Design an enzyme around this catalytic site. Sequence first.
Site, PDB file in Angstrom:
ATOM      1  CE1 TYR A 123     -18.115 -46.347  -2.191  1.00 39.14           C
ATOM      2  CE2 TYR A 123     -18.306 -45.930   0.144  1.00 39.14           C
ATOM      3  CZ  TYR A 123     -18.118 -45.448  -1.142  1.00 39.14           C
ATOM      4  OH  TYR A 123     -17.870 -44.136  -1.385  1.00 39.14           O
ATOM      5  CE1 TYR A 145     -20.848 -43.134   7.119  1.00 41.31           C
ATOM      6  CE2 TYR A 145     -19.560 -44.770   5.932  1.00 41.31           C
ATOM      7  CZ  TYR A 145     -20.465 -43.736   5.933  1.00 41.31           C
ATOM      8  OH  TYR A 145     -20.933 -43.322   4.723  1.00 41.31           O
ATOM      9  CG  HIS A 203     -17.407 -32.809   8.267  1.00 42.89           C
ATOM     10  ND1 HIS A 203     -17.644 -33.436   7.075  1.00 42.89           N
ATOM     11  CD2 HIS A 203     -18.583 -32.601   8.907  1.00 42.89           C
ATOM     12  CE1 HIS A 203     -18.947 -33.603   6.988  1.00 42.89           C
ATOM     13  NE2 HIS A 203     -19.541 -33.115   8.079  1.00 42.89           N
ATOM     14  CG  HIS A 258     -25.057 -40.858   4.372  1.00 40.91           C
ATOM     15  ND1 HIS A 258     -24.922 -41.464   3.139  1.00 40.91           N
ATOM     16  CD2 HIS A 258     -24.057 -41.340   5.136  1.00 40.91           C
ATOM     17  CE1 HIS A 258     -23.900 -42.320   3.210  1.00 40.91           C
ATOM     18  NE2 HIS A 258     -23.327 -42.272   4.416  1.00 40.91           N
ATOM     19  CD1 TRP A 313     -17.462 -30.494   4.300  1.00 44.04           C
ATOM     20  CD2 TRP A 313     -19.421 -31.579   4.429  1.00 44.04           C
ATOM     21  NE1 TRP A 313     -17.331 -31.711   3.663  1.00 44.04           N
ATOM     22  CE2 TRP A 313     -18.500 -32.390   3.730  1.00 44.04           C
ATOM     23  CE3 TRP A 313     -20.701 -32.056   4.642  1.00 44.04           C
ATOM     24  CZ2 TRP A 313     -18.836 -33.625   3.232  1.00 44.04           C
ATOM     25  CZ3 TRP A 313     -21.029 -33.303   4.151  1.00 44.04           C
ATOM     26  CH2 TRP A 313     -20.089 -34.075   3.476  1.00 44.04           C
TER      27      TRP A 313
END
Length: 187
Positions: A130, A182, A18, A167, A88
């Site tokens: 994307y 990713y 994050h 995710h 989060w």
Amino acid sequence: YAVKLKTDFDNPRWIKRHKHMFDFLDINGNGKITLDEIVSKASDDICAKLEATPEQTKRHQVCVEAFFRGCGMEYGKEIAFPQFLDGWKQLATSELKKWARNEPTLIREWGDAVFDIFDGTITLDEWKAYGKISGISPSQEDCEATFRHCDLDNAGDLDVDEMTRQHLGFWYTLDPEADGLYGNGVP
Ligand SMILES: O=C1N2C=C(c3ccc(O)cc3)N=C(Cc3ccccc3)C2=N[C@@]1(Cc1ccc(O)cc1)OO
Ligand SMILES: [Ca+2]
Ligand SMILES: [Co+2]
Ligand SMILES: [Co+2]
Ligand SMILES: [K+]
């Protein structure tokens, strides 16, 4: 693979994941971001480049607003990383309660909105676009890594149910089965 449900909020790798994303959003390097900036990136930048329809842009914006409000963001509210991360933790907790109840999560619904702009499957070339347009993964090799990493459908496309499971593990629980989602684009 069973999605890892236990959180791991003190793991330096989860913090780093994050922190990477926060610093990616903090384009001007002043240590704070706002919901206004996030929504502009979603709507004025990403959806415009993807040629989303007006209804798709609006739906996507509602989902982005709800998602990031779930991490404590708000229009006009300047949030620095520690408070963002605390947000989060709250989002993850809330999302996992929804997941346990088989209620769609905010990360699922954001996914639905993204996938619908790409016509609930996306192709590798769409994911590559994307990655560049959102900026989260501008290397097409890291986008290839995403498709290698995930379980794909029979055409070799990615489904939103699988991306949502990934995710949950990548953003919320630091699931080892989600590592590398990713590629090297996001640690
Ligand atoms: O998951 C995703 N994101 C997570 C974060 C993000 C931001 C901050 C963090 O601390 C952690 C994660 N930032 C962005 C990129 C973005 C940011 C702001 C506005 C629009 C887009 C982003 N794009 C998504 C969209 C998506 C969602 C569900 C799907 O099934 C498929 C695609 O795919 O990567
Ligand atoms: Ca900033
Ligand atoms: Co389906
Ligand atoms: Co298969
Ligand atoms: K694969």
